């Protein structure tokens, strides 16, 4: 025959990886270089920006590591955009930009630093970096945590990075992964980046659908038709969303509703139950076999 690979010795000698590595969620090799502060800085926090693009949502958080577990100081979710105006299209590059800007403004507004470091109020999509103003508190600084995402040109993590940078946070970066960088010419097209930020790359797609096909367009953008969004008005609604975000970035928690205390999953049965079960299984097998014989 053949050896059994998953042998008792195999399990005895097997060493499991970390839980996050087993679930595939964390790259500890990158985390070690990302979240570790220099020893002569002592307990100076090393803030970092976590951006995670989900199948239906964008998660943006600000976190610094602590022994019992890293603590989140500010967080912003893409599904909060309908409050500010973006009713649909919660995953695209524009939505990433708005959620990053919202996270930045929320941090500063919590943090008492709005009148300083306004950043790029007028979006340009070019290389911008904030400088600390003398006689005033220094600009907030953090580093991007791309996670397991492939950092190729035009990634929505970099879109969120640009959004927060225009918001006012000081994050080191280069205009190489923004949409618009042309590898061959090694140049940056701020206008192309701006149109990607404002969502024109979806507007021309919908107009392209208008050009030839209608049912395919409905299939591709069903909720767009239901929410009554047209290709031309997307730039205006994104501008309005940016204005509303910069106006009122504070977050209010939803009121808590009392629980009815209903258990939805099976509880763990006890030793007495699981022993009675095997006892009666043996009794039943014996009583069945004594007749079947």
């Amino acid at each position: 025959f053949v050896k059994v690979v998953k042998n008792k010795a195999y399990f005895k000698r097997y060493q499991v990886k970390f839980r996050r590595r087993r679930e595939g969620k964390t790259d500890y090799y990158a985390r070690k270089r990302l979240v570790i502060q220099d020893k002569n800085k002592y307990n100076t926090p090393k803030y970092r920006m976590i951006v995670r693009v989900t199948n239906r949502d964008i998660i943006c958080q600000i976190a610094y590591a602590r022994i019992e577990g890293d603590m989140i100081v500010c967080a912003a979710y893409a599904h909060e955009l309908p409050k500010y105006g973006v009713k649909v299209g919660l995953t695209n590059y524009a939505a990433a930009y708005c959620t990053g800007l919202l996270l930045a403004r929320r941090l500063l507004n919590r943090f008492g630093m709005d009148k300083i470091y306004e950043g790029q109020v007028e979006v340009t999509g070019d290389e911008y970096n904030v400088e600390s103003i003398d006689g005033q508190p220094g600009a907030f600084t953090c580093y991007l945590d791309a996670g397991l995402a492939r950092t190729t040109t035009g990634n929505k993590v970099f879109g969120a990075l640009k959004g927060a940078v225009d918001g006012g946070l000081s994050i080191p970066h280069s205009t190489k992964r923004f949409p618009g960088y042309d590898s061959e010419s090694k140049e940056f097209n701020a206008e192309v980046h701006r149109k990607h930020i404002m969502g024109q790359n979806v507007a021309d797609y919908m107009r392209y659908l208008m050009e030839e096909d209608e049912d395919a367009y409905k299939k591709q953008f069903s909720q767009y038709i239901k929410n009554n969004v047209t290709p031309d008005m997307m730039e205006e609604m994104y501008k309005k969303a940016h204005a509303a975000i910069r106006e009122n970035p504070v977050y209010e928690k939803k009121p808590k509703r009392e629980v009815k205390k209903k258990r939805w999953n099976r509880p763990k049965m006890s030793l007495a139950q699981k022993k009675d079960r095997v006892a009666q299984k043996k009794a039943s097998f014996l009583r069945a076999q004594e007749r079947a014989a």
């Binding site: 095997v278 299984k281 043996k282 097998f285 014996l286 076999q289």
Partner: protein, 205 residues
Amino acid sequence: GRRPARCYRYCKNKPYPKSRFCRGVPDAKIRIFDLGRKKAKVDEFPLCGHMVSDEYEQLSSEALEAARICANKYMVKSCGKDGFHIRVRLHPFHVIRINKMLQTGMRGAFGKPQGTVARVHIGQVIMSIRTKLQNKEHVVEALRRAKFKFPGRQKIHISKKWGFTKFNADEFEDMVAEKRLIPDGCGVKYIPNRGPLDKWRALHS
């Protein structure tokens, strides 16, 4: 041809087995470690007798073989050709060395391999005989006359276990009747109350 056995009786060196470091070791003379009707079940040879060492020493592989031959000869003479089962429970793994003299002297005096011996502790079994209940004095006499092929002092002990097993003979039969151990080959398998119920059903069906 070989040096007297008194020159290698005490466990004076660390165990020096044959391995990738100790090469060129001549083959030990003893190759067969059990004989008789070894292809017998566990319920026909209940009586078990051990020869137990009383000294901490090292026994030569060849002396092991000589004692085995003597015991087998007496057993085939007494209890028939297949009324017993021998088992030598000592394998020679510690090789000994010799620094032969042909005149360098004691320079570079690390020996070449000469033979193999087995290190024996106090109260350790050397040979075991399993047979029927009635051949008790036959077993005792066979082991007694095999004692003369060994150095040091040895004792004969009629074990209270059943055959070559680790279970007491005075409830071995009760336990096998109750089906707590299942016979196989020349031994038994313990069946604890821990496996999946499928095995329990299989062996109670």
